[PDB]
Write a protein that holds these residues in place. Structure first.
Motif, PDB file in Angstrom:
ATOM      1  N   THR A 170       0.826  -1.200   0.000  1.00  0.00           N
ATOM      2  CA  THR A 170       0.000   0.000   0.000  1.00  0.00           C
ATOM      3  C   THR A 170       0.862   1.252   0.000  1.00  0.00           C
ATOM      4  O   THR A 170       0.522   2.237  -0.669  1.00  0.00           O
ATOM      5  CB  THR A 170      -0.953   0.003   1.196  1.00  0.00           C
ATOM      6  N   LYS A 213       0.122   3.937  -3.068  1.00  0.00           N
ATOM      7  CA  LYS A 213      -0.296   5.298  -2.754  1.00  0.00           C
ATOM      8  C   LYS A 213       0.788   6.304  -3.123  1.00  0.00           C
ATOM      9  O   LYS A 213       0.492   7.383  -3.650  1.00  0.00           O
ATOM     10  CB  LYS A 213      -0.646   5.405  -1.272  1.00  0.00           C
ATOM     11  N   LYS A 247       0.831   6.970  -6.824  1.00  0.00           N
ATOM     12  CA  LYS A 247      -0.210   7.918  -7.210  1.00  0.00           C
ATOM     13  C   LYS A 247       0.156   9.344  -6.800  1.00  0.00           C
ATOM     14  O   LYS A 247      -0.082  10.297  -7.552  1.00  0.00           O
ATOM     15  CB  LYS A 247      -1.550   7.495  -6.612  1.00  0.00           C
TER      16      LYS A 247
END
Lengths: 52, 52
Positions: free
Chosen positions: A10, A14, A17
């Motif tokens: 994760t 993240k 992005k």
């Protein structure tokens, strides 16, 4: 180990992005600077032909 | 189960990696796209001013 892998997984998704957003921010800002420079030069081109 | 989960933890890391790369790839594509639309517009407006 499942959850410790998920932590970095994760993290990376993240963070990908997030940096992919900051790059597009730079994209827009550089567009704006490019266009303003082009326009500010075109105006003096016009003024040159006018003075001629 | 612990062997299977270790085999699972590589897949999640690997997909986080590849998808981080596809995301950054699309964001770089969009930057190289908007910075080109910027040129296409800026030159048109330059010509419009000199035509003014």
């Amino acid at each position: 180990d499942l959850d410790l892998a998920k932590a970095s997984a994760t993290d990376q998704l993240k963070k990908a992005k997030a940096e992919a957003q900051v790059i597009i921010e730079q994209a827009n800002k550089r567009r704006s600077q490019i266009l303003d420079e082009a326009k500010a030069e075109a105006e003096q081109e016009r003024t040159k032909i006018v003075a001629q």
